[PDB]
Design a protein around this ligand. Structure first.
Ligand SMILES: CNC(=O)c1ccccc1Nc1nc(Nc2ccc(N3CCOCC3)cc2OC)ncc1Cl
Ligand SMILES: [Cl-]
Ligand SMILES: [N+]
Length: 278
């Protein structure tokens, strides 16, 4: 192990493009937390070498976005940021989260999808979490199974706010394509620069997520980003023969994955859907 301020850093629980996640025991409150360790130089370098004398939110700015956003949130279905250790003289940046003990609900693809009942239970948490974020005027933009952490209590917490957008008024008005390709809504994948609303992007990703829950793979898939984007825009939704799923679940998924955001089901409607109300 190693000591970092009041934390004893132990088992490594995750490693990804961002940085590493360690189990951390806090000696002052005798509680365990997840500590994410990042290098600032590495995040900067990950953007690519700066060009000599539209540009995306670089990786370091995604990290700082996440900090700024999580400081203002408090909901049981959203991961809590507990502390940030950021010395201007150190390269390392440390983000301490509450421990969500079972880790991501699913790696996609999987041969072991969730049962309908487990899918519903987690989906209920997802709805509550997203309804809260939208109420707080945040569009998540990276909803997917791997960003949904299952706690010791069996409930989901939403993570990964790096490409999120805040808005004023009723909705975000967005023109940039960010997040995870398989989960990006068709209206964000237009040839010509267009403006699209934010909340509906999150509903679409929720739909892809719920399809993943019960089927273990995305409804639209291709190893090539550009062909994937084309399938998201042009392919009609299909369900496999097996596993058979309830008609009310197929209806919900169909309505979340309406390609036209004007008619796509909204969260108040999802909360009323028969599959959700059991
Ligand atoms: C967005 N995804 C993440 O933040 C993330 C990805 C991979 C691993 C961990 C991880 N982040 C957390 N992970 C946890 N908790 C985990 C996660 C995975 C694990 N694994 C331990 C080994 O068996 C599989 C589960 C344990 C754990 O706490 C004991 N708590 C909070 C956060 Cl923020
Ligand atoms: Cl995923
Ligand atoms: N996170």
């Amino acid at each position: 192990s190693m000591q970092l301020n009041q934390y004893t850093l132990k088992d490594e629980i995750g490693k990804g493009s961002y940085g590493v996640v360690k189990l951390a025991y806090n000696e002052n409150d005798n509680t365990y937390y997840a500590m994410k360790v990042l290098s600032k130089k590495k995040l900067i370098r990950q953007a690519g070498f700066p060009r000599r004398p539209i540009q995306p939110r670089g990786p370091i700015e995604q990290v700082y976005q996440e900090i700024a956003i999580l400081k203002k949130l408090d909901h049981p279905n959203v991961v809590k940021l507990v502390e940030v250790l950021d010395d201007p003289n150190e390269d390392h940046l440390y983000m301490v989260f509450e421990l969500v003990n079972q880790g991501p609900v699913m790696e996609v693809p999987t041969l072991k999808p969730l049962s309908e009942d487990q899918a519903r239970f987690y989906f209920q948490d997802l709805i509550k979490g997203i309804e809260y974020l939208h109420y707080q005027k945040i569009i998540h933009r990276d909803i997917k199974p791997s960003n949904l952490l299952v706690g010791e209590d069996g409930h989901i917490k939403i993570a990964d706010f790096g490409v999120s957008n805040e808005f004023k008024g009723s909705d975000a008005l967005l023109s940039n394509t960010v997040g995870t390709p398989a989960f990006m809504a068709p209206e964000s994948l237009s040839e010509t620069r267009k403006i699209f609303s934010g909340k509906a992007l999150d509903v679409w990703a929720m739909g892809v997520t719920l399809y993943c829950f019960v089927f273990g793979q995305c409804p639209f898939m291709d190893e090539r980003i550009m062909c994937l984007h084309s399938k998201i825009k042009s392919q009609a939704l299909e369900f496999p023969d097996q596993p058979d799923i309830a008609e009310d679940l197929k209806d919900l998924i169909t309505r979340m994955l309406d390609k036209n955001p004007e008619s796509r089901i909204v969260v108040p409607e999802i909360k009323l859907h028969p599959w959700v109300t059991r």
